[PDB]
UniProtKB/Swiss-Prot annotation:
Protein name (database record): Serine/threonine-protein kinase Chk1
Major location category of this protein: nucleus
Range covered out of full length: 4 to 270 of 476
UniProt GO molecular function: ATP binding; histone H3T11 kinase activity; protein domain specific binding; protein kinase activity; protein serine kinase activity; protein serine/threonine kinase activity
Catalytic activity, reaction form: L-seryl-[protein] + ATP = O-phospho-L-seryl-[protein] + ADP + H(+); L-threonyl-[protein] + ATP = O-phospho-L-threonyl-[protein] + ADP + H(+)
This protein's domain notes: The autoinhibitory region (AIR) inhibits the activity of the kinase domain.
Subunit record text: Interacts (phosphorylated by ATR) with RAD51. Interacts with and phosphorylates CLSPN, an adapter protein that regulates the ATR-dependent phosphorylation of CHEK1. Interacts with BRCA1. Interacts with and phosphorylates CDC25A, CDC25B and CDC25C. Interacts with FBXO6, which regulates CHEK1. Interacts with PPM1D, which regulates CHEK1 through dephosphorylation. Interacts with TIMELESS; DNA damage-dependent. Interacts with FEM1B; activates CHEK1 in response to stress. Interacts with TLK1. Interacts with XPO1 and YWHAZ. Interacts with CDK5RAP3; antagonizes CHEK1.
A GO CC term assigned to this protein in UniProt: nucleoplasm
Tissues expressed in: Expressed ubiquitously with the most abundant expression in thymus, testis, small intestine and colon.
Species of the source: Homo sapiens (Human)
GN (gene name): CHEK1
GO annotation (BP), single: signal transduction in response to DNA damage
Length: 251
């Protein structure tokens, strides 16, 4: 099947890979039959660590998005192992870039996870899929988020325990969990709730258990600052930049 000039070559995720018969350019195609908001949000985005939005056309609705040859960051993680520290650090820098940007235009992704961090040919990281995204700052006014979403393992504690919560710390939490899985190749908990055994152990600082033992002490220190239950004591992105591991030379 094809749309306009573009031919849908293969299924990517629905999302197909589209190649132009004429220009031979490859793009990502989103086929939908909250979409309006996603299209609106995509237009507002212009960063090198965020998937490009080319435009949309209704028929089924069609979102035209940058194609990342690399695929998911998820594939680059090795189970129980993770990826080499220099690699994870670079990836984590590009994620901070993309997320800083969104935050500065009042946008929160709300679903950060390795499945939604795509890699281009140069292996540059792109924040992907704004179907769950929303505005948390408009006209210089911040709006707290009440709706629950994202993926349990990457979700912040306040979101399960609070009527309303700030958007930004939630994206920082998710970024920590993503850091953890890059360095450890496994996720700490099914969910951040106290009922879960793994979360409680972390709260008590039982670092000896997995996956913390697999992680070096510099990054582990950063994660001690990121996975802080108090959304208000949690470290901010501006502070993550000053983190020693973040600025440590690697490779
Ligand atoms: C596996 C391999 C490549 C991919 C892949 C490559 N390029 C893109 C662009 N967008 C998406 C996407 C997905 N949802 N919303 C947008 C996926 N992509 C995706 C999965």
């Amino acid at each position: 099947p094809f749309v306009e000039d573009w031919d849908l070559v293969q299924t990517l995720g629905e999302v197909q890979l589209a190649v132009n018969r004429v220009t031979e350019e490859a793009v990502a195609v989103k086929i939908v039959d909250n979409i309006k908001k996603e299209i609106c949000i995509n237009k507002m985005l212009n960063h090198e660590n965020v998937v490009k939005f080319y435009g949309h056309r209704r028929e089924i609705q069609y979102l035209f998005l940058e194609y990342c040859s690399g695929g998911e960051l998820f594939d680059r993680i090795e189970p129980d192992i993770g990826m080499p520290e220099p690699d994870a650090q670079r990836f984590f820098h590009q994620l901070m870039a993309g997320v800083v940007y969104l935050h500065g235009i009042g946008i929160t992704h709300r679903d950060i996870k390795p499945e939604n961090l795509l890699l281009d040919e140069r292996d540059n990281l792109k924040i992907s899929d704004f179907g769950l995204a929303t505005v948390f700052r408009y006209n210089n006014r911040e709006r707290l988020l009440n709706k629950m979403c994202g993926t349990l393992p990457y979700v912040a504690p306040e979101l399960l325990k609070r009527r309303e919560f700030h958007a930004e710390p939630v994206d920082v939490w998710s970024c920590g969990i993503v850091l953890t899985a890059m360095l450890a190749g496994e996720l700490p908990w099914d969910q951040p709730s106290d009922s879960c055994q793994e979360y409680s152990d972390w709260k008590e600082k039982k670092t000896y258990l997995n996956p913390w033992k697999k992680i070096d002490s510099a990054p582990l220190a950063l994660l001690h600052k990121i996975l802080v239950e108090n959304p208000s004591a949690r470290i901010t992105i501006p502070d993550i930049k000053k983190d020693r591991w973040y600025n440590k030379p690697l490779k």
